[PDB]
């Protein structure tokens, strides 16, 4: 196979459970698993199922989850229900459930399906049976070893990376959610076998971590990379730092597999976010990573203006497939959600970009200094 | 991370 030049269309395996959209976090809660069903239905109506393999994930077992999470926390998640909450008030506080991370009907099953897609995708990659695996129900990057955080309960990303590490010496994690990928970075902070790269809003903003001076520790020193940003970053600003940083990371770290969290709360108009990317600017990140021709697990994450989440992950599936799709949306079960325009692509707002071009270049220059410290 | 409620 010495003739390979690393191009070609890529084999894509996509994971989805038709039950996922029915899980409900509660009245007024911004996290809406329904957006995954909206994404699926939109990409079915564009015909993208003709171009990829579609799999229904298994329900990951408590035991699969305790490859990272503590036994006590997973036992709690398996046991807690809206009808027995009163008896668990102490454990709810200890594991940080019942505020941002509510108890809801089927919580554990939702975690099992989110996680099952990511671990199943990792196995498929390890078996060299696909180039890309996609799980838009995964990417729940804030969950910690023994606590929920940030609408995330089980860290499917950490579990998928642990699976990749069975066959890959070095794994690269890239996080374009507007929030810092703190749960993933914490899990791998002291190893060089996982490099974590997060771009995120930083300053009076959840979760409060991801300073560019957070670079890892011990054998993991220089293997955590954080790009802190201000409100209002736009396509042009993002694209001028993302490809140079990822290219330098690829050059210095030479990973053999990549996990890309595609949290869509970095889009213009997100309910919780303060960035100004379009779907095209967000998806340029997938294009950039895809060109390195490494085994790639693409995951979901945040995204709280759900019409735009469905647009984003539909277009990023098309990008993974190297399929052009029209801007005019096909009819679909959720067509009214996409008015008044009924187009796939979105316009940025007139919000001010507080990330000056000088700020962007200066942060990039500082991270390049840290990347020079790899062997 | 919800501005409308809590500390996240
Ligand atoms: Na991020
Ligand atoms: Na690391
Ligand atoms: Zn987020």
Numbering used by the authors:
A (entry chain A): 5 to 379
B (entry chain F): 500 to 507
Sentences from the paper on this structure:
To address this challenge, we develop a computational “anchor extension” methodology for targeting protein interfaces by extending a peptide chain around a non-canonical amino acid residue anchor. To test our approach using a well characterized model system, we design cyclic peptides that inhibit histone deacetylases 2 and 6 (HDAC2 and HDAC6) with enhanced potency compared to the original anchor (IC50 values of 9.1 and 4.4 nM for the best binders compared to 5.4 and 0.6 µM for the anchor, respectively). SHA can coordinate to the zinc ion in the active site of HDACs. In all the crystal structures we obtained, the thiol functional group of SHA coordinates the catalytic Zn2+ ion with a Zn2+– S separation of 2.3 Å in a distorted tetrahedral geometry reminiscent of that observed for the inhibitor Largazole.
Our first computational method (design method 1) started with docking structured cyclic-peptide scaffolds onto SHA and re-designing the residues in the interface to improve binding. We selected docked poses without clashes between the macrocycle backbone and HDAC2, and then redesigned the peptide sidechains using Rosetta combinatorial sequence optimization to maximize predicted affinity for the HDAC2. Tens of thousands of conformers were generated for each of the 100 peptides, their energies were evaluated, and those designs for which the designed target structure had the lowest energy were selected for downstream analysis. From the previous pool, five peptides with the greatest in silico predicted affinities were tested for HDAC2 inhibition in vitro, the best of which (des1.1.0) demonstrated an IC50 value of 289 nM. The crystal structure of this design in complex with HDAC2 revealed two distinct binding modes and peptide conformations in the three protein chains of the asymmetric unit, suggesting flexibility of the peptide as well as presence of iso-energetic binding conformations. In two of the protein chains of the asymmetric unit (chains B and C), the peptide conformation was very similar to the design model, but the observed binding mode to HDAC2 differed from that of the design model. This binding orientation interacts with several water molecules through backbone-mediated hydrogen bonds. In the des1.1.0:HDAC2 co-crystal structure, the dominant binding mode in the crystal (chains B and C) has considerably better predicted affinity than the original design model with the same peptide structure. Thus, the lack of structure recapitulation in this case was due to insufficient sampling—our original design calculations were not extensive enough to identify this lower energy alternative state. We found that a large-scale parallel docking algorithm which allows movements of side-chains and backbone of the peptide and nearby protein residues can reproduce the overall peptide behavior in the binding pocket for this design.
